[PDB]
Design a protein around this ligand. Structure first.
Ligand SMILES: *Cc1cc2c(cc1C)nc1c(=O)[nH]c(=O)nc-1n2C[C@H](O)[C@H](O)[C@H](O)COP(=O)(O)OP(=O)(O)OC[C@H]1O[C@@H](n2cnc3c(N)ncnc32)[C@H](O)[C@@H]1O
Ligand code: HEM
Ligand SMILES: O=C(Nc1cccc(-c2ccccc2)c1)c1ccccc1I
Ligand code: SF4
Ligand code: F3S
Ligand code: FES
Lengths: 102, 138, 613, 239
């Protein structure tokens, strides 16, 4: 029937292999286009990451929903900042490069 | 009786009882895969905490990235002490990267036996020490 | 009355036991539409039929051409003509129908090139009415047949609306004016006493193999349902007949399947010779269960001991292919490695004759009905049934054939359902018991609750086990049984002097052991007194004083000009045993064996003969 | 003579104000059987008949003895006693389980989860049941090897951390393996809907491949592997 939970499981693997493929790609081809894709994959895999953690340890009819939203806000605020960083600042790729030769 | 009713009757009996829970984390034997699964969750949580705090302070703190980098040089930490901070970042990142590959191989259905769990597990652990040193001095 | 909390349950039919027999009887009733209860002291899957490894006999004909009438002959021949042929007819006739039914439940039988159920050789079977060599009709799930038989039936039982009383030790039958109304059962969980009344009752508690020291049977084979029948004053049949499985580990006494002998494995002595060829050369080490162990026990005494104490024999599987002991026999390959510490591939396995099967039990009409002995005849106890090893339809008689017990359950568990579904209807007037009845079961329980004395409950069991093992073993003489009989009667006097320790209500495993001990003694006294009474050598029962097979005729020459022996002159009759609970006194009667079939024209009566494999 | 010390978990619900406490028993390994259960029986029959546990087959197929000996969940009738006399063997009930009394865990929840997956052959044609044997090839019977052998001892589920925390919504390895057993079974016609009964965040997807279940299995089965096999089918199945 309606493949809901199985598709989300696949979705986590799809972004995980993508993120695995993007760490050497950002190193070999550092550009302001690879900057955003890294921010996209880093936050999505991170959101579905902590998602599993919350649905595991947190038990509650009322406490579960608040954490789902509390995480969603924190993820949106994370992804927004990285896109702001890739626009109005140095940008992840060049930013790490600067940090490493310190 | 239905399966649901049996499960419902269990909890009503046991939550309102004097029965004690048997120990689990106190008594259970430690193993490499079991301890390596904990560190993967640890490195996951710790890695997202850094990623979140990096983008979060991009909107909440004044100045560009260069001004913050010049602020680091103000403390002028030693080459060995700055290497420790450099090693401290990559170590959880690489452990979670390599063990992630091991996890993704399991999703294909390969390497799911007891001898293989210890083998590929040690391979990840060794690849973590070498890649992290190979990147801390990069 | 309100000292112990009483919960009066009401059902159409109760089944006491969750093994292959009780489980099949349980869900078979529900399938027809009966509000069925299932009282069991263990979880259904954790019964005994789990330990079954050999297989399940059925003339399906998958390796060869096969007739079920050949299997009919094979069984009665093995039963030493103490088997009731009307019951043996019904079984072998339904064998191909019952197994196909099990495969249709999903039971993963081993397969062949054609895709049909795998069949292989087993001890006691033969094609063409005992002429056409070795027969392969033993259906098997690769050395774990019974486990898979119990799991697939249990899974199927959830497909129905049966009530399951998991971990409920049943005490006594709810009897009123010769009529069974159900059972009075102690809930192990909390110590609450329940009365599960019904219009009918099925008793399938299996064997009492724990009366002996060395047995293959589980710690729960304590003949509980047999005792429930005995305490009501109802007879017990053929209790002295005990099957000794030839192949079983010398240490703990665990079973090594007859499938090991069926695949090609040979029994070897300390000398090295194929010794079963020296005894019975026609079938060799794949002969009758009683005869093979008869040879083994004799071989130990002559001086052919294979151990440091010289008290065991070897079973050889070295000569068979190493990867054949992985496809066909993987279960015995592991259990011999764990217990004996012996590789099956390059080393033979230590084997010793141990108590295995109980063909005796509760007298049964082929329909599954429990019979009592009224006026030297057969009268039915209304609303009381028995199926499986607990029962005694004497489909096995004097010796059970190779892998016929797993057939016993599925067929006679089926019969108990069908015989209720044809006699009465669901929702019919469930007869009401007295508001007091069952009081003496509770009072017996309550006296044991604070049981104070000298002899420990555990110690008395150990004093009973060695008394049976030394006296009523494989071979038994008159004089050794006479001292053995008064020795068991001595131990029955030590039931008020017994000491119990745990005095709680929840999970009192100390209390149920004493209840099991009561049931074990009630099974022991009739196994021993019945054995000393029988003055002949028949099947598993072998008297050294009387090695004669005493029948109504001497079957050496034709029954032409021979005088028919009176009923109390011969021994080709069922041993019916009673026992007074208050003094431990054993009284015993005898009833005729059934020689006729269900249809003479379709299935021929097999006349008695000098049987030797 | 040889002395062996056993640290056994004890509890009595009938004694008022009693809380879980350990108890020591000393056993001569010379006058006792080679297995843990042989000791547990001995300390009950001779030493103290207050001890409670589940025993039956004493050979390792009934699954009554499921307990935590020395950190791992195996059958007490199969695990042999540590001949190292300078150690005290720790005996506990199955981890994170309600203890009815003394080493006896309430598995009624565990059994109910087994009922929910419906472990029986389901055909689209119930009309021909009990007259013809369904043809299954030997190579299709191979796929069932390692799955039918399950004892339902529960040693694997009760070792799973995820089953500890979420022992209500998550089915666990013992049960999930059986759901797989009926998925690849050649005869079974209801397989898509068997996979559909797992389309929720807990049923199947609370496994994180910790693999602690496989390591502790008494019969050497691989429930973790089988769980991972189900996961793939959920991503592939169509219509
Ligand atoms: C012991 C044995 C038997 C055996 C075998 C191997 C071993 C070690 N291998 C066999 C084989 O390969 N092929 C075959 O045909 N038979 C084999 N057998 C014999 C056979 O499998 C069994 O011995 C026989 O089928 C017994 O089955 P049955 O259904 O009659 O009962 P059970 O399996 O022994 O289980 C007993 C049930 O009764 C309940 N019970 C007992 N007492 C009570 C009380 N007090 N109150 C409530 N319930 C009670 C138990 O709970 C149990 O479910
Ligand atoms: C490119 C390298 C990476 C790979 C190959 C990878 C792989 C994986 C996989 C497959 C999982 C699934 C969890 C499981 O079922 O066990 C996971 C968990 C997780 N990952 Fe990553 N990951 C990577 C990088 C990152 C990064 C950079 C972060 C930080 C933002 C992160 C955060 C998390 C979190 C929070 C979890 C949850 C832990 C859990 O579910 O048990 N990952 N990782
Ligand atoms: O909670 C998890 N394990 C956990 C958490 C806390 C303690 C123990 C543990 C420690 C020692 C012995 C046994 C278990 C195990 C966990 C870890 C990784 C992925 C998913 C999970 I649900
Ligand atoms: S898979 Fe193994 S550990 Fe799990 S319940 Fe079955 S036999 Fe026990
Ligand atoms: S069952 Fe639990 S122990 Fe395992 S493979 Fe899934 S995490
Ligand atoms: S008692 Fe049967 S498994 Fe240990």
């Amino acid at each position: 029937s309606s493949k809901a939970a199985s598709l989300h499981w696949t979705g986590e693997r799809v972004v995980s292999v993508l993120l695995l493929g993007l760490l050497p790609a950002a190193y070999l081809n550092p550009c302001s286009a690879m900057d955003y894709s890294l921010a996209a994959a880093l936050t999505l895999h991170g959101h579905w990451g902590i998602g599993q953690v919350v649905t595991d340890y947190v038990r509650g009819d009322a406490l579960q929903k608040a954490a789902k939203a509390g995480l969603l806000a924190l993820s949106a605020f994370t992804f927004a900042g990285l896109c702001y960083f890739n626009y109005h600042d140095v940008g992840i790729c060049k930013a790490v490069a600067m940090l490493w030769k310190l | 009786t239905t399966a649901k009713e049996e499960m419902e009757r269990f909890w009503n009996k046991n939550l309102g009882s004097n029965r004690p829970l048997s120990p689990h984390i106190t008594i259970y034997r430690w193993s490499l895969p079991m301890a390596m699964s904990i560190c993967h969750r640890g490195t996951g949580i710790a890695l997202s905490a850094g990623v979140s705090l990096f983008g979060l302070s991009a909107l909440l703190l004044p100045g560009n990235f260069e001004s913050h980098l010049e602020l680091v040089k103000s403390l002028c930490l030693g080459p060995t002490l700055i290497y420790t901070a450099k090693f401290g970042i990559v170590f959880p990142l690489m452990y979670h990267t390599w063990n992630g590959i091991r996890h993704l191989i399991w999703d294909l259905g390969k390497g799911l036996t007891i001898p293989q769990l210890t083998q590929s597990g040690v391979v990840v652990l060794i690849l973590t020490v070498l890649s992290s040193v190979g990147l801390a001095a990069m | 009355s309100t000292q112990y909390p009483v919960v009066d349950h009401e059902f159409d039919a109760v089944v006491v036991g969750a093994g292959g027999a009780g489980l099949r009887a349980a869900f078979g009733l529900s399938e027809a539409g009966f509000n069925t209860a299932c009282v069991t002291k263990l979880f259904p899957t954790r019964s005994h039929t789990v330990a079954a490894q050999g297989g399940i006999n059925a003339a399906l004909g998958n390796m060869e051409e096969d007739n079920w009438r050949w299997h009919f002959y094979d069984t009665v021949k093995g039963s030493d003509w103490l088997g009731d042929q009307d019951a043996i007819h019904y079984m072998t006739e339904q064998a191909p129908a019952s197994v196909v039914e099990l495969e249709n439940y999903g039971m993963p039988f081993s397969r062949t090139e054609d895709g049909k159920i795998y069949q292989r050789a087993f001890g006691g079977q033969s094609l063409k009415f005992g002429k056409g060599g070795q027969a392969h009709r033993c259906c098997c799930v690769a050395d774990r047949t019974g486990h898979s038989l119990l799991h697939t039936l249990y899974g199927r039982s959830l497909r129905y609306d049966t009530s399951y009383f998991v971990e409920y030790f049943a005490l006594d039958l709810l009897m009123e004016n010769g009529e069974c109304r159900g059972v009075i059962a102690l809930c192990i969980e909390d110590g609450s006493i329940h009365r599960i009344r019904a219009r009918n009752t099925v008793v399938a508690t299996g064997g009492y193999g724990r009366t002996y020291f060395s047995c293959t049977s589980a710690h729960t084979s304590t003949g509980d349902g047999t005792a429930m029948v005995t305490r009501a004053g109802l007879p017990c049949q053929d209790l002295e007949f005990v099957q000794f499985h030839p192949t079983g580990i010398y240490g703990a006494g665990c079973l090594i399947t007859e499938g090991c002998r069926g695949e090609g494995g040979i029994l070897i002595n300390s000398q090295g010779e194929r010794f079963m060829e020296r005894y019975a050369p026609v079938a060799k080490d794949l002969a009758s269960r009683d005869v093979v162990s008869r040879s083994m026990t004799l071989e130990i005494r002559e001086g052919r001991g294979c151990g440091p104490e010289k008290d065991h024999v070897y079973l050889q599987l070295h000569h068979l292919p190493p990867e054949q002991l992985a496809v066909r026999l993987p279960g015995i390959s592991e259990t011999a490695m764990i217990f004996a510490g012996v590789d099956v591939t390059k080393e033979p396995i230590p084997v010793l004759p141990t108590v295995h099967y109980n063909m005796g039990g509760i007298p049964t009409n082929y329909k599954g009905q429990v019979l009592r002995h009224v006026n030297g005849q057969d009268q039915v106890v209304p609303g009381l049934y028995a199926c499986g090893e607990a029962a005694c339809a004497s489909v096995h008689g004097a010796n059970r054939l190779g892998a016929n017990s797993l057939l016993d359950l599925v067929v006679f568990g089926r019969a108990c359902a069908l015989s209720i579904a044809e006699s009465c209807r669901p929702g019919d007037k469930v007869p009401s018991i007295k508001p007091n009845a069952g009081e003496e079961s509770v009072m017996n329980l309550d006296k044991l609750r604070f049981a104070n004395g000298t002899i420990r409950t555990s110690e008395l069991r150990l004093s009973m086990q060695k008394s049976m093992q030394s006296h009523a073993a494989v071979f038994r003489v008159g004089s050794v049984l006479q001292e053995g009989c008064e020795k068991i009667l001595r131990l029955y006097g030590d039931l008020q002097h017994l000491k119990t320790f745990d005095r709680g209500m929840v999970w009192n495993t100390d209390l149920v052991e004493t209840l099991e001990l009561q049931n074990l003694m009630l099974c022991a006294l009739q196994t021993i007194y019945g054995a000393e009474a029988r003055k002949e050598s028949r099947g598993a029962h072998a008297r050294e004083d009387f090695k004669e097979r005493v029948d109504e005729y001497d079957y050496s020459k034709p029954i032409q000009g021979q005088q028919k022996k009176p009923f109390q002159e011969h021994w080709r009759k069922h041993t019916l045993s009673y026992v007074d609970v208050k003094t431990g006194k054993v009284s015993l009667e005898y009833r005729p064996v059934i020689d006729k079939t269900l249809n003479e024209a379709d299935c021929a009566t097999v006349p008695p003969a000098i049987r030797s494999y | 003579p040889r002395i062996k010390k056993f640290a056994i978990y004890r509890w009595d619900p009938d004694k008022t104000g009693d809380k879980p406490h350990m108890q020591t028993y000393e056993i001569d390994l010379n006058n006792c059987g080679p297995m843990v259960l042989d000791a547990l029986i001995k300390i009950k029959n001779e030493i103290d008949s207050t001890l409670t546990f589940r025993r039956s087959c004493r050979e390792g197929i009934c699954g009554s003895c499921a307990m935590n000996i020395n950190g791992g969940n195996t059958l007490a009738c199969t695990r042999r006693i540590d001949t190292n006399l300078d150690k005290v063997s720790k005996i506990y009930p199955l981890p994170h389980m309600y203890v009815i009394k003394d080493l006896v865990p309430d598995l009624s929840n565990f059994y109910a989860q087994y009922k929910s997956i419906e472990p029986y052959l389901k055909k689209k044609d119930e009309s021909q049941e009990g007259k013809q044997q369904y043809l299954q090839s030997i190579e299709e019977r191979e796929k069932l090897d390692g799955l039918y052998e399950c004892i339902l001892c529960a040693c694997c589920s009760t070792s799973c951390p995820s089953y500890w925390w979420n022992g209500d919504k998550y089915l666990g390895p013992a049960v999930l393996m059986q759901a797989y057993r009926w998925m690849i079974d050649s005869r079974d016609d209801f397989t898509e809907e068997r996979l559909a009964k797992l389309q929720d965040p807990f049923s199947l997807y609370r496994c994180h491949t910790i693999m602690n279940c496989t390591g502790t299995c008494p019969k050497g089965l691989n429930p973790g592997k089988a769980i991972a096999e189900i996961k793939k089918m959920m991503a592939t199945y169509k219509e």
